[PDB]
Amino acid sequence: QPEPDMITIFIGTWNMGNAPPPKKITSWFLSKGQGKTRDDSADYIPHDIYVIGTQEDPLSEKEWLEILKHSLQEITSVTFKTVAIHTLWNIRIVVLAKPEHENRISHICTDNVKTGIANTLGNKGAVGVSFMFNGTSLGFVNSHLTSGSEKKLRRNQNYMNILRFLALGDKKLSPFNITHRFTHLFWFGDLNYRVDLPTWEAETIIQKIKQQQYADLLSHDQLLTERREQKVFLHFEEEEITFAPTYRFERLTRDKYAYTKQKATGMKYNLPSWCDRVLWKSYPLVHVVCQSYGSTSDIMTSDHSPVFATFEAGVTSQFVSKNGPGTVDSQGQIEFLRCYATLKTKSQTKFYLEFHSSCLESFVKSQEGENEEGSEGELVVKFGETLPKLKPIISDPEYLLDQHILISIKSSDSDESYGEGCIALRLEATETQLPIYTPLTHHGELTGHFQGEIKLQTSQ
Numbered sequence: 001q002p003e004p005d006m007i008t009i010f011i012g013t014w015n016m017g018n019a020p021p022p023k024k025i026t027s028w029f030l031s032k033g034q035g036k037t038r039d040d041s042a043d044y045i046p047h048d049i050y051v052i053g054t055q056e057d058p059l060s061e062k063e064w065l066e067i068l069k070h071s072l073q074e075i076t077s078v079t080f081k082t083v084a085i086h087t088l089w090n091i092r093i094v095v096l097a098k099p100e101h102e103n104r105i106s107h108i109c110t111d112n113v114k115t116g117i118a119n120t121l122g123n124k125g126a127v128g129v130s131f132m133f134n135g136t137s138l139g140f141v142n143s144h145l146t147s148g149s150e151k152k153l154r155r156n157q158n159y160m161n162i163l164r165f166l167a168l169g170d171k172k173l174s175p176f177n178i179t180h181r182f183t184h185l186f187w188f189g190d191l192n193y194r195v196d197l198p199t200w201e202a203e204t205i206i207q208k209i210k211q212q213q214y215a216d217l218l219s220h221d222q223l224l225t226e227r228r229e230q231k232v233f234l235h236f237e238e239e240e241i242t243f244a245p246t247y248r249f250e251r252l253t254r255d256k257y258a259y260t261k262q263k264a265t266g267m268k269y270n271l272p273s274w275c276d277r278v279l280w281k282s283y284p285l286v287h288v289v290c291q292s293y294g295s296t297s298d299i300m301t302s303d304h305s306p307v308f309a310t311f312e313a314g315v316t317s318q319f320v321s322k323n324g325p326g327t328v329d330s331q332g333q334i335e336f337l338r339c340y341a342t343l344k345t346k347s348q349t350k351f352y353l354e355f356h357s358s359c360l361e362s363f364v365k366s367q368e369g370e371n372e373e374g375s376e377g378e379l380v381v382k383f384g385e386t387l388p389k390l391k392p393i394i395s396d397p398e399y400l401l402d403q404h405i406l407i408s409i410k411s412s413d414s415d416e417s418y419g420e421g422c423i424a425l426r427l428e429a430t431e432t433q434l435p436i437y438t439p440l441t442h443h444g445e446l447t448g449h450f451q452g453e454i455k456l457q458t459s460q
């Protein structure tokens, strides 16, 4: 029974509006409705992993698990296994996997983050799950961010609190937040970003939606504009949106957007918006392809429509050699030439690097770099040819070329990371000096860059 080198992953997000679901929700798991939809010829083919995020979910965990599992069994005739379920208030994540994957999945983590303070603490936040699938780390975040058209900055703040404080994945990766801990990270939810057009334009917006003309709406979508100004979700991907806004509908039809201010809305307008989203971030040069992104048309119990997205995702096997794991393989090495970090900091500590990777027995600390002043004001930290030679546990190029090295640049004074990044070992050549590059972030914001050259020796 061969190990897979690809799997498919379903992501769903649905703000249920505190209402029980209708009796049939299969269109959601089949990626049928509006947008980029899944071919009918695939309907009986199960995804490997299903990850369901709900918000305003009124059900118990038991009640929702029975609906989900019976739904998938009806579609596929497979009885899925529950990997994890975690709920914060009415925000929930369920991970289901095909039974054949049970002994490929390990290191399951769950966590939540509550956003806001006082007034603003008590219903928004995020839940998440991570696990290993053979050699591949997977992370999943379902967030319900702050509502309201004039609160995009609050949403951005909620995002940074969630990536800082959600504790998923390998705790030994201490310098790294969730945006660096996983081969593949999926972040979805009722992100609550709105179409920022004047209230007076509500009927015009509705007209455009009926004509399936989304371009002049998407150009005012706050998530796309905030991402283009690098205010949120830096280095994440989203498929093109080709479905109608998923909020705010009159319940029990999809014929009507309910946008006008009401006591029930706190006298706020809810112009039609793409509240409900799926984004991802994968390590460099790992296969990830979105194969569907859309909304259902026939699930009408909520004022939101469910959103689906599906992905092909590259995975690797749990590699054993005669040498590693449990020792090094002297036929392998990773070297760095002419490396330097460019940092945006105004501070003047010395800095050192840490290299973290599951291809190493443990993380490696460099010597301190040499600080110089850049020509446009910057701090440049030069390592030259001074970085330690890294000794991977396995030298076989079929393993090593699939690995990644996380880098943190840390203050000598405080041992605090000033920037984190990731280098792929999927090189064009071995035993050859080749340029490498990563942006550096801290708390998910850009703090600098790391560049130089690598020389990778494998057993071939």
Ligand SMILES: CS(=O)(=O)N1CCN(Cc2ccco2)CC1
Pocket: 224, 226, 227, 228, 229, 230, 235, 236, 237
């Ligand atoms: C919607 S956007 O924020 O304006 N924007 C457009 C170009 N860019 C491409 C890119 C480069 C690195 C990662 O992704 C995606 C982000």
